[PDB]
Write an enzyme that holds these catalytic residues in place. Sequence first.
Site, PDB file in Angstrom:
ATOM      1  N   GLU A  61       0.825  -1.207   0.000  1.00 22.77           N
ATOM      2  CA  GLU A  61       0.000   0.000   0.000  1.00 22.77           C
ATOM      3  C   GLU A  61       0.862   1.261   0.000  1.00 22.77           C
ATOM      4  O   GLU A  61       0.842   2.069   0.927  1.00 22.77           O
ATOM      5  CB  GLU A  61      -0.977  -0.006   1.179  1.00 22.77           C
ATOM      6  N   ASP A  62       1.628   1.415  -1.079  1.00 22.24           N
ATOM      7  CA  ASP A  62       2.341   2.659  -1.371  1.00 22.24           C
ATOM      8  C   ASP A  62       3.431   2.925  -0.337  1.00 22.24           C
ATOM      9  O   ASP A  62       3.499   3.994   0.262  1.00 22.24           O
ATOM     10  CB  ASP A  62       1.369   3.838  -1.454  1.00 22.24           C
ATOM     11  N   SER A  63       4.286   1.932  -0.132  1.00 18.99           N
ATOM     12  CA  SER A  63       5.399   2.035   0.792  1.00 18.99           C
ATOM     13  C   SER A  63       6.602   1.378   0.139  1.00 18.99           C
ATOM     14  O   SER A  63       6.479   0.681  -0.870  1.00 18.99           O
ATOM     15  CB  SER A  63       5.075   1.382   2.135  1.00 18.99           C
TER      16      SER A  63
END
Lengths: 117, 1131, 67
Positions: free
Chosen positions: B759-761
């Site tokens: 999730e966007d990490s």
Amino acid sequence: PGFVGIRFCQECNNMLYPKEDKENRILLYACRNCDYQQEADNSCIYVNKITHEVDELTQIIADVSQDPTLPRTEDHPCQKCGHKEAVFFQSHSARAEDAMRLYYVCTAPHCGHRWTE
Amino acid sequence: DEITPDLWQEACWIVISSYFDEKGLVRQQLDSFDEFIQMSVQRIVEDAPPIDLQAPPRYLLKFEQIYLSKPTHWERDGAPSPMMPNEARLRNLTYSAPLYVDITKTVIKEGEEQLQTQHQKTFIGKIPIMLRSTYCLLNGLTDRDLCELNECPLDPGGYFIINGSEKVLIAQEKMATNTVYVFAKKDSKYAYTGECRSCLENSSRPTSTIWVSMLARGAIGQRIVATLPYIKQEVPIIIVFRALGFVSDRDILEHIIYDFEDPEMMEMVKPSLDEAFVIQEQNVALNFIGSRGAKPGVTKEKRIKYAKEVLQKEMLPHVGVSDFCETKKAYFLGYMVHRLLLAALGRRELDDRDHYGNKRLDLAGPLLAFLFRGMFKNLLKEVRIYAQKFIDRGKDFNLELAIKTRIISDGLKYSLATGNWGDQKKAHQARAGVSQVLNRLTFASTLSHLRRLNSPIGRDGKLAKPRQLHNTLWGMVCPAETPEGHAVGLVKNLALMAYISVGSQPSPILEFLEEWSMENLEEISPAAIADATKIFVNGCWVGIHKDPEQLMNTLRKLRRQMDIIVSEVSMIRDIREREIRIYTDAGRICRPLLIVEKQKLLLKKRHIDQLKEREYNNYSWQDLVASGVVEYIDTLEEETVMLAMTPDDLQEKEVAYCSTYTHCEIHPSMILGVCASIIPFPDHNQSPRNTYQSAMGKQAMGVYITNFHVRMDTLAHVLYYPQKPLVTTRSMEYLRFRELPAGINSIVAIASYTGYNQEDSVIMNRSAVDRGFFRSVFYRSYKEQESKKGFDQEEVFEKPTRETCQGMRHAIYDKLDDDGLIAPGVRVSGDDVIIGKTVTLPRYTKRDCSTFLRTSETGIVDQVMVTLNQEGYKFCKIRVRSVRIPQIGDKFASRHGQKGTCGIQYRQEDMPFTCEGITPDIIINPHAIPSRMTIGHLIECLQGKVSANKGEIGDATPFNDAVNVQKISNLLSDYGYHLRGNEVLYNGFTGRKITSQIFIGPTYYQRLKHMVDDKIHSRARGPIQILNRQPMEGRSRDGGLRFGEMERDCQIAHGAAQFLRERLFEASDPYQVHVCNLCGIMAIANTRTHTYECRGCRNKTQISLVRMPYACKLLFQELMSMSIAPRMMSV
Amino acid sequence: MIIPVRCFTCGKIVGNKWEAYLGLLQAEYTEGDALDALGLKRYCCRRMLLAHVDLIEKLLNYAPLEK
RNA sequence: AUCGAGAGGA
Ligand SMILES: [Zn+2]
Ligand SMILES: [Zn+2]
Ligand SMILES: [Zn+2]
Ligand SMILES: [Zn+2]
């Protein structure tokens, strides 16, 4: 039928309004500024074209053939001069629903013939 | 002679480089300011009327010439010295130059006793100077000279320094003036409205808008009205025509209808004539206008005079404001009515509010001119009062004492300092957001802020039409760069080759049209206007012509030869409607294009040859423009242009698309702006991704400017090891991203590894971070000054003492010196003191007012600067230095909208490795790609692998058919790698191969300003606000987090009543009041003596204690302030 | 601003190769051949030398604080 | 410290 144009007085150059002469039972066009009167020649006072059956060929001008952004075609020669090339374009005018119709104009200079297929 | 396709990609970019060698990226700002100083100030001073004052003797005081010296600074001794911009930045001065005006006062009393006294160079004000402008001390200096002055040679300039703060004027959008625009509002009494914001050539008043509308159908037909200025009632157009001296209906329709063979126009104007027949002479019409006005004179004489003055001054000033211009005004108002009828008859299209051909960009020059007109008018007013109070006594006066120069100086300084664009008194009618603080976070942010445009539609407006990316923004505004918050589509950015016109006078064009076969408008008969072509110049219908085609050919030849027509003049021939509109005014956004012959470019190979040796034979861009090979085309002239996207479009094809092109793109990639020109392969991304990167390139760390060692900026981030991208576009060569890059090439692996990048990490390499990977330094500047404002109380820098100072915190002051200032190299932790300031009292005779560190920083003092501010007390700036090593929670981004925070950091032995022991610097999750469709990220990774293995820099220019994925893959397969960029990786923990071959390679990543350490915050019973005893707001104030209405609603849905009461009563503002059980109003309690009494009821026994929030007590008291009786009845 | 000491990825020393790299480039080597001459075979170290921007040379255009 | 404005983040 055709439309009816405005006509002006010969003295005050104001518009002549319609009036009826009971004595002769005849249409007159009289100025409500001066005291001029005229014998009408059309007998029609008002015309409304609800259908708006306007010949858009009259709205076109030959100068549009000088537009570099218009498309040109060699497939529709001119009936008036025989030039091969011609610009074409759509109506793009409001109050015209069936406006996919194409209007052609001859690109020959000083001919400027306009038509429609 | 012809440039062949194989050479084209060089030739075009050579041409582009020449442009940026000539102009730069902030040319619009500098040219605007230069025109304002060279022309606008002088025009404003001369356009002011001479102030004739007399009791007798009389004085005129005519201002005749201006002189703007170079920027100087006056010390307390008064010695003028040349002030450098860096000295202004450091000392909090204003980089301004003095404006002196020549004044001529002639004494005229009687008997031809005349004598003139001229005051040469009367100091009229101080004008702030845009940096790198002609009137800047950094003008024409070499890079060595700028470095000698502690200036960055890459600094573009284009901004002002007001009180040490770098302020940048944002170009403001506005509807163009002197042009008739026929719109149609769906919800209004009018069917069609034709407006014209009219403004005289040399501005002296606001835009006078005139409307000419048609009343919506439903007396008999459709009536045409005219909403004149300064008149609060609609006026029939025929009345206006008669008030201008055209009483006969024939004359009025001669002016309105140019083709008498057209009864449709006639019957549509007839209702207006029928409605105006009782009024038939000029005086009666003027009386009617005056009566409909908002100041109806009881006597018709002054009514007629007022109507005359309105119709001569406020109605259509651009047509002419002098007398005897009624013919021109009548022709123009008839043209407005004609345009309205053409729209109502469907013969013309309604005008598009969003078309940028209909808009103008109000730049620094024309904005400073608006300020200067207002301020000079106020100055002349003050001079009038001052001189009047002296001549009323019958004696001479000194104009030097009449001129209070603070008007112009403080006005310009205030307006540029705050951004409130207008007089300081009208601080609410003024429009803010002009003149923002220049963004100095990275070089791209500075360039973009200097190329920023603004649509002042209002962020509150929820109509999407002005926010939409209009078709006409092509080549003028970046399609991608725009804020994604509440100002989508309103704040814009120039495209790279976009040039905003600076303005020019139409005099040479009008003179040539006179010498040419144009016929003036007063000399013609209206019968000629039918077949003839109208000619407008800056909105004014000046005449008519018979062969518009060869007129346009002549004018285009003249502009391409740099003859009387300058390059920025727009010349649009509308063919279907026979107008020829010529524009010379300022604010017209345009762009350069390659002119095209029959089907060939005029840019032959000889031009490219001379451009290649640009540095020897001084053959520049201007020689390319003067050769008639390049042309600036504005948004409105693009409508008449047929563009070729590339010279390949000019090739004869099996089916010719156009075969009549007129221009060609220099390169399509120039449609992008500064921040979108850094995206590699932006045509392989979803467009929202390109917009998000264009926003995120501005928060990326790098080296924002070369001379960062001398700047005392409030906040500054410098990356330890900036790298130029391995995969670059050919536009960054002009953005100077290669000289001041804002990222690092990271070996990024797109993989699912341990789940810490979901999730966007991202997962970063701890070993790489140990080696200086994405390490930065954070510089924070604190300012302080000791004020000796009066003998009542004076501040002073000195090491405080526990025995004399009163408000002295428990923090130790040992790090300070006897001068009260900490020394460089001293390690300072949170809450520490850097400046020891003490203020004399009226813990005796001095109180501690020391400057602490912003809490929880823990830096080292980088340097300390001491100087004197403008007024001249001691002034200190302390720059503290804090090394920011990337960590979990720091935000990173690629150039494709792929942002994410560091989830975890693994050491090199914990990261996955290739057969040759390469570990990824970053690991990002594959799930960030599919929905986003950032294929440019993958192509950039593959191109970067090829570039690193080949020893080159990849070409990721957007539209390049010589670079596709198959070529890059074939190249990569030559270096012993899987052609698609995959590799077998091994698990770092176990060493086993990963079943799925991972996609890994160099990608340019950016470290963004948003570090977690600047965001983490906690509170447990800290300070509270004064008014309502609730926690403060902000990290800096040690404030509490807001438990808002939506949180209240969520906890109500949960049913958690005690938690809701804890959050909204006990953790915010618990309080107690004493209420009278009879009247329910808060009583008087005395808990020390235990005496509770209500003065209202005169009881002291029936009082009750009530536990309520302090905000509720404050509410009830503010209601009692309003005579409301909120009675808290406990029974 | 200055050539890193180690390669961020592997930890190979690249600090002693910037000057040699520039000397090879003025010797009419291609960047790839220059990187091959210095022994940078992994594309991470080639990234380090090939993408470096020597900003310190521009920071040395400013006179120091003390003479 | 207050107020406003502006720039940003989600
Ligand atoms: Zn008459
Ligand atoms: Zn023909
Ligand atoms: Zn009571
Ligand atoms: Zn390496």
